[PDB]
């Protein structure tokens, strides 16, 4: 695998992470590779004696672009974790029980636990210590992404069929076919698995 | 996702330039090698690199083949005749705006090219407006097909997603209110 391939995968990951309403499986491996590449190029430029020439400016502008992509990805994921930290831990544990790929990396999980404790302290000092003994439990809201729509484009050849709710009869469901160049306005939970597998690009 | 990030993604496309400087080795970018440069001999580099050289007077930009006036007229003819959105080159509007912003000296038949691009944008905008208005009268489905939509066109039209999410709650309330 080349760094030229790693950067191309990272850009598609960044676009999907911005568009999706909830948390995708983590891709901090590519982030770590690209940060190491930035540091290597910086030290290599630092060994040069002459810097007022075209090559150094071209290299520095490319490092600017890669730094923007990685920073914006990490900022989006932290802003998603801050909205509901306990639910993120719960979903990560459920994916581990199902035997699927990781939702959070180790540092992300550590951040989530420490933020959850820091958020609990404020409520306990302000309200919950004054409550009667039955009312001292900490509230945690349920998930909220039930009726969210997305614009989605199909890229893979053999995606197959998708099921969506039936607004004429909400007891049942309707089946759709996804031909391999199409764009759709569709609920997110129908295309969730294909977005994880990389067969669909969100717009 | 917004228009600045759309332009940022559009910057990764490749375009052909003619340098006036010269250099011996290649340049080993993380996105891959681009050099070497010889004066007066064209070669292909990314669009962001091309604009960076053009600002420093180090090259001349060669416009894409789809900026020919005949090709733009073909695109306008197909867009007029088809009921849905016609197919376009990748990042069509973004690359057009970037090149008119930074390299309009090298475009040929600039005013005619500019007017044809504005015509194409106007009637694609009207098609998207009519499709969204006709969708929002629906109650029977929560699905639509929008083939050949561009990324910036999708980015400008995110009110429909919120409107559909609001409609789904009232539909679900009626279904739960149906007696048994």
């Amino acid at each position: 695998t080349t760094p030229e391939e790693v950067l191309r995968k990272m850009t598609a990951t960044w676009q999907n992470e911005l568009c999706a309403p909830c948390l995708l499986p983590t891709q901090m491996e590519l982030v770590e590779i690209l940060l190491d590449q930035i540091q290597g190029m910086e030290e290599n430029i630092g060994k040069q004696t002459d810097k007022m020439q075209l090559r150094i400016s071209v290299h520095r502008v490319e490092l600017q672009r890669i730094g923007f992509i990685t920073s914006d990805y990490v900022r989006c994921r932290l802003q998603k974790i801050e909205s509901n930290p306990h639910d993120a831990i719960d979903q990560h544990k459920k994916r581990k029980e199902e035997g699927k790929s990781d939702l959070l990396s180790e540092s992300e999980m550590k951040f989530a636990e420490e933020y959850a404790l820091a958020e609990s302290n404020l409520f306990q000092k302000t309200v919950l210590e004054f409550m009667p003994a039955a009312l001292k439990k900490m509230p945690v809201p349920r998930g909220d992404h039930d009726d969210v729509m997305v614009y989605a484009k199909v890229t893979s050849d053999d995606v197959g069929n998708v099921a969506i709710p039936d607004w004429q009869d909400l007891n049942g469901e309707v089946i759709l076919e996804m031909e391999p160049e199409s764009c759709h306005l569709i609920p997110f939970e129908s295309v969730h698995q294909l977005v994880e597998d990389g067969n669909i690009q969100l717009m | 996702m917004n228009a600045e990030r759309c332009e940022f993604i559009a910057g990764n496309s490749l375009i052909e330039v003619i340098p006036s400087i010269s250099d011996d080795r290649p340049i080993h970018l993380i996105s891959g090698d681009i050099g070497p440069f010889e004066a007066g001999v064209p070669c292909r580099i990314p669009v962001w690199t091309a604009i960076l050289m053009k600002r420093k007077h180090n090259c001349k930009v060669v416009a894409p083949q789809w900026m020919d006036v005949d090709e733009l007229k073909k695109i306008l003819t197909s867009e007029t005749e088809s009921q849905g959105l016609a197919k376009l080159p990748d990042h069509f509007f973004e690359i057009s705006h970037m090149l008119v912003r930074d390299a309009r000296e090298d475009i040929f038949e600039v005013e005619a090219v500019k007017s044809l691009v504005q015509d194409i944008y106007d009637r694609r905008d009207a098609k998207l407006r009519s499709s969204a208005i006709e969708f929002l009268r629906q109650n029977q489905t929560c699905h639509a097909q929008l083939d050949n939509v561009q990324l910036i066109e999708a980015s400008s039209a995110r009110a429909t997603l919120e409107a559909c999410r609001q409609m789904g709650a009232v539909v679900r309330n009626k279904h739960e209110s149906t007696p048994l």
Partner: peptide, 16 residues
């Protein structure tokens, strides 16, 4: 010697 990103990636593959 002329620097290249691929050698840096091979070194990091050996590290991790």
């Amino acid at each position: 010697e002329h620097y290249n990103p691929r050698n840096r990636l091979k070194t990091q593959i050996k590290r991790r």
